Design a protein around this ligand. Sequence first.
Ligand SMILES: CC[n+]1c(C)c(C(=O)OC(C)C)c(-c2ccccc2Cl)c(C(=O)O)c1C(=O)O
Ligand SMILES: CC[n+]1c(C)c(C(=O)OC(C)C)c(-c2ccccc2Cl)c(C(=O)O)c1C(=O)O
Ligand SMILES: *Cc1c(COP(=O)(O)O)cnc(C)c1O
Ligand SMILES: *Cc1c(COP(=O)(O)O)cnc(C)c1O
Ligand SMILES: Cn1c(=O)c2c(ncn2C)n(C)c1=O
Ligand SMILES: Cn1c(=O)c2c(ncn2C)n(C)c1=O
Lengths: 812, 812
Amino acid sequence: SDQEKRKQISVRGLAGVENVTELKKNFNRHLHFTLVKDRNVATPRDYYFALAHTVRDHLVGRWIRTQQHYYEKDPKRIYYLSLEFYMGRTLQNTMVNLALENACDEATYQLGLDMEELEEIEEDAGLGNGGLGRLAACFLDSMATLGLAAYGYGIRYEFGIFNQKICGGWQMEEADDWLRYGNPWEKARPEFTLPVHFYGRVEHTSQGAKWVDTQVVLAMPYDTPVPGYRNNVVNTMRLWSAKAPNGGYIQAVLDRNLAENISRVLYPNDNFFEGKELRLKQEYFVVAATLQDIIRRFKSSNFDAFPDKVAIQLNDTHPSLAIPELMRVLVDLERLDWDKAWEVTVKTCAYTNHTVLPEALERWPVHLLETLLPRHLQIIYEINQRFLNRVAAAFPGDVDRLRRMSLVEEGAVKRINMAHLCIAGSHAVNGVARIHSEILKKTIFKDFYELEPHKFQNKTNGITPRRWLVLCNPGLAEIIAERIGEEYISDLDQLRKLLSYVDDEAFIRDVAKVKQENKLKFAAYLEREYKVHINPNSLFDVQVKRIHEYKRQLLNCLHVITLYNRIKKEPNKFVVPRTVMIGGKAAPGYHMAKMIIKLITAIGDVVNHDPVVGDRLRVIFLENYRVSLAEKVIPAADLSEQISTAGTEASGTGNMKFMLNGALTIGTMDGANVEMAEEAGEENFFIFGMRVEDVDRLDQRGYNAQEYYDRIPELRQIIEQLSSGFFSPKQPDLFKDIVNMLMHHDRFKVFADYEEYVKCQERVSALYKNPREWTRMVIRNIATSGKFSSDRTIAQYAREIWGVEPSRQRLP
Amino acid sequence: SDQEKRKQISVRGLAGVENVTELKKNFNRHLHFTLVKDRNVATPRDYYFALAHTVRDHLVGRWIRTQQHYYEKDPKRIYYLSLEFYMGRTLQNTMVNLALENACDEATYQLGLDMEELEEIEEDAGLGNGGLGRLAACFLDSMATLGLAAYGYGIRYEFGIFNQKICGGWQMEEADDWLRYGNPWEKARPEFTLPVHFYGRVEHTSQGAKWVDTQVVLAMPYDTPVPGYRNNVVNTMRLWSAKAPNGGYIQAVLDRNLAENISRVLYPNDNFFEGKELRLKQEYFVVAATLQDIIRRFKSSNFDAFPDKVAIQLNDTHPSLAIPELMRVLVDLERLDWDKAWEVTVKTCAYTNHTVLPEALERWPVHLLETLLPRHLQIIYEINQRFLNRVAAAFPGDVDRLRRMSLVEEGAVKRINMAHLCIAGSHAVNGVARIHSEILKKTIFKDFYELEPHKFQNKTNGITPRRWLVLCNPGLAEIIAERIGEEYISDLDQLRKLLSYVDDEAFIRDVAKVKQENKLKFAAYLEREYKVHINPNSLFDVQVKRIHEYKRQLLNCLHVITLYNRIKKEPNKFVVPRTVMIGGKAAPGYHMAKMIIKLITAIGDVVNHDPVVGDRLRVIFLENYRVSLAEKVIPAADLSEQISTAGTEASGTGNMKFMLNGALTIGTMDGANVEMAEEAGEENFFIFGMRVEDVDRLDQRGYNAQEYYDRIPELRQIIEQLSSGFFSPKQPDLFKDIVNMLMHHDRFKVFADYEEYVKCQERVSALYKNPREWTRMVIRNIATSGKFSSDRTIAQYAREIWGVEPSRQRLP
Ligand SMILES: CC[n+]1c(C)c(C(=O)OC(C)C)c(-c2ccccc2Cl)c(C(=O)O)c1C(=O)O
Ligand SMILES: CC[n+]1c(C)c(C(=O)OC(C)C)c(-c2ccccc2Cl)c(C(=O)O)c1C(=O)O
Ligand SMILES: *Cc1c(COP(=O)(O)O)cnc(C)c1O
Ligand SMILES: *Cc1c(COP(=O)(O)O)cnc(C)c1O
Ligand SMILES: Cn1c(=O)c2c(ncn2C)n(C)c1=O
Ligand SMILES: Cn1c(=O)c2c(ncn2C)n(C)c1=O
């Protein structure tokens, strides 16, 4: 009796067995009881919510069963700490991974509703800036699919990356109020709310050190379920929210907003460091809370065993404070000896580097750290002293090496090099692509690689074949399925078997049919939502990614102006029709990126209205590029632009998405482009321009953009057009800053790759003129994209870093 | 087909038929699917939520059916506009009104859970300061129970009235974060979000006037269901939330908090005007949005008929801007002629006055109104000019009357008298108790009553017998039920039949048993939650209400010190044991009220620890008095303190709650005390002190507190104790401000009612010495409390103001 009567309370029976009858029944239940509405007044969004709740209900039993499982079994747990999780929409992905997509589709049909229309109501969970944030998301999905006891820990931003609008040809930012109508996926967990301390001071009592007189901010966790692919595994992504603890009474209540501002907005900086204190607060916030929850879970089924049960993976140096924080807790609170604590920390943490550009790396002024986190700065200084002590003993007399490896950067404003802190405190540091990992060992991390070679590894990036194929390209996924089955969805290497169809007329006809369907659908979407008309019988040339100087959208601009100038030159000469699409957001305070977006639209203003050009060349800027737009435009792309200056793009992932969806790649030998060309065969790729050693040689003697301007008539014509106001009649000097940078301050040598790029583009159109051959080369790409599935990347992290074994064994 | 297939989507079948089996089934469903939890990790609060969701599900079918009904039938709609709705908890009230209390109680029993424990997890929706806010709440409940198409419109405050804590004997305020774990009762309605304009300017174009260049703030409505008593009627309370519309990008996103601050906190001022701009914003916010929604509903099944379909009731002058706003919309937007629009407005609005104290009435400086609401000030000036024109024609030559009746108050700071605006723009102005309504006609509103006598009415306040008897006092409700049935719950006048039992030994034994049970329960609650020990065999003397000078808690203080001094004087003389309880909150910036709370605890510090006093007299301050605490302490009260200075308390409602729950009243002839004494018979009451005419006479010759001090030795002793530091040893002069006020600046003549009060208290204890006679007099009170049920008050408002007929006919 009594406590035995609570056995009734169980997950035992849910909404049935996963079919149409019960699904409709539950959709109805949610529409009336959850939305307190009826068919007469239900709005489309209401219907979207009804469906989402019905679908989420299917997650619960598995969600609870999975966490119970990890508790029972107690496997080593993997913690992915990141300040970004670019998740995009969840509805379709959840249905796909639970195998409910067809049933929901039928159920909503019989209820007279259109599921596709409803799925469009859901807005992106854009809690990320780009690559790094999307990778976290692909990683969550792969770890679930691989049966890993993995937890994604981040910040629940009230406002994700701003929604971009184009006004007058310029980018205008708008707050991304994504939680306005609520979030059907998350589940708050008040009982797990934790305190995070700021400021205060440090007093050294008999015992040890004490952090006193601090300002407290509470961290409330919100759980979102992450389902593996049909294995009945549902993992958790825990995002922390800032809550105030509990000039007059009124103002004091209004001021609660100050402490809760911590989790308000995602800093919109992609590959750029801004040392704003609010950002440092967000970083410590997610770290402190996350570590408390990790230790709690560790204590609930001494610290010697911590590394055997815990793996903390740092996505960049953003959550690097986890290293000194873990030490603070172990030494200050758990009273462990410094060295034993240090051993534990290094064995627990592993750091992932995502770039090599100096401006993108974190260097926090010490004054900011001493006022905001006094004891962390003290611990960092002690970590430094003991680390430098080791290099001094390993390289006696090498004082300059000491200076270069120090965690502290002397100068006008003393700063703390976060990347150095991570290497000292992690047992593994990794690059995200073979070429990037190698550059790390030879350049920026060279000193460290010499002191501890074992520490450095490579983990080439990936994307999940679920969201990035099955989800976004059902057509491609089905034709691939009719030939080789469905086992590829969680074994992408099987795509290899498609090579056997390179000469199959049916498959060749199918691949091209699917691509043109997607191109048709995307064109319909653009005209409906933006009243933008694009020629579906043109070659879709697409470059989507954040606007950057290093990504060289500018190089792409030079090419489209060349295409236009050549046409005007020889109007009656035939050219492969092209629809050049460029999309991506610019960080708010990044002037040049904002100038580039304006140049793109400026070019379009001329090109798209020239009667002699007509249907032959259209240049359009895809507004507000985000995960959901990527799922639409990438499957409709013919040519994938991946033209970053060699050695600047650590890896790239969009490149992989394009390859997996039937697009041929034109790019440099940079990041993962190198490994993609190796997998398909360079004969099936469109590699061009300088190689890393080539830019290095150019650097040694000096890059003089004037030389290329003096030597290339076609290039001179374009710059003259830009300078003279040909693309800005009403404001002639509008692009002077772009021209000036190109001519005298181009760190990315655009002019130096112009000629080879244009010629390589000629060969792309030459191949496009032959559909059959274009299609056959596409096949050889898709068939070799298998190594770029995040399941492979994750399996390597697991076995080579975390020390855990992946598994595709389903749960009941 | 197609649209005929959507007929399936219906409320048709819910969680069954309202019994234990299905209830458990649904509680379980909610615990797993709604809370994403299971029995192993479910927290008590989780269980509280599970139950609340299960119960709320029972509301939906009725909720939808009721609104559908009003749409179909299209009755005249009643809109209750108020800046406060003191709703307290909803769980029990919902169960009670739906007749699910027993089933839920059994269902939770079989699931091994304790419903009472779970109900305590829910916190108060304290969106009110006191009487005025509670009245709105009682009114919502009565209008539902009476089958009226009524809508409560207010502001969804993120923070209700602060939670009061006592530290060092003083009140400390804490933000009331009532939405922390969510609100299971409300349902947001994004699709009904509306824009509210501020600042800007007015330009007069050909057509008319235009309000341009304004700052916009969005108003998102949240619906809470309000169930009638077992009639299947569920009405709506719509509360608006502030949302920003859509120094750098980051700061701009953080600054969204400024516009959303509008609905952040409830101003904690009870009976006091503070002209803060943020308050004016809240007032316009609720008015603008509410009126847009009202006109929408009016247009969706010309304006001549507006008054026949709409009734806007102003709870005080807080939402008075509704008058100029309705004119603005009708003239500016709907282009109606001024006079036709004015006719419409007056016929639509009716104003309710709640006080007579000058400091509690609204007078907004014109400079504040011209910058924040330029066109409203213009419309107010035009309303004034035309109103003054009428009085001038009705009283030719009376220029001073013009000056006194003007909506504009000249002087250093020109201001707008809101009360005057309401009288000019309402077809009915009403007081809240017979004596109050009469004072209005003779004093403050005299000029207006002379110009338009038809306009002035009285509507004596009430409380709902559901929350205030059935809910809070099940014991009393049951014994009353076993004698006369249950029809009284919605026909309180039936309580009259209890007079027939005044000499029934069974009933007399029962009434006293129920009261002692409640006294026992309350004592248990106080010791458990506050480790406060109270003698259950003492007479519970209780004064709970907001701390005020006019409510005279100070007079009560003088009495308890007298009780203590008399005991010390004659230690071995027998005295009726008393537990004097005083509770209530002080507005943050109200010094004297804060000094009073400190004096109360100070007195307790001496009294409660004097060994010679022992169990004979205990003085305790009930911390954080709110609706839920009222439901606990009032049913356990023996003596109800209602001692405001005659003519200051417009009506009071707590007085009614005490009478309905078996407590005898000691009070002045003020507010509704007068009508309560009339109903029970003054022989069954404990009326004392000056009458209105007595304070007026004292005012004419001047109030000299020194006279009473010179003439009353016992009074002199107390003041000497206060001044000398007897109740504040460590800080001798701690209460000098209280003494000084009493001696020379007492607007409420405490000293003048001291003697009669003490003597009247003697007669209370004389009666308490005779349980049988005390109980019989209690019976005669409860049996005559029937006129004070809000159902009666509401029925009068309906028939005499709104022009609609109440009804107890159930819906299917
Ligand atoms: C006690 C062991 N855990 C387990 C079996 C969980 C569970 O049943 O979760 C289901 C409701 C999704 C889960 C958990 C525990 C308590 C409150 C809320 C959650 Cl969510 C966690 C966690 O940290 O999240 C566990 C852990 O490990 O400490
Ligand atoms: C179209 C007529 N109304 C009606 C039958 C309602 C209803 O079915 O409500 C149920 C979901 C609780 C209700 C309504 C209408 C549209 C969206 C949300 C609500 Cl809530 C209202 C309202 O203003 O609240 C109605 C009104 O009158 O305009
Ligand atoms: C994949 C992805 C990225 C990263 O793209 P790269 O071209 O590798 O820089 C950025 N944004 C979105 C929305 C993505 O889906
Ligand atoms: C009824 C009520 C009031 C009003 O009480 P009065 O004594 O009439 O001033 C104030 N506060 C609460 C919590 C109430 O329930
Ligand atoms: C110079 N600069 C910036 O100023 C910048 C930026 N991203 C954001 N900002 C503000 N990037 C990438 C950049 O190179
Ligand atoms: C003088 N005074 C105040 O100063 C006050 C108040 N309520 C709030 N405040 C700030 N009351 C009722 C009051 O009489």
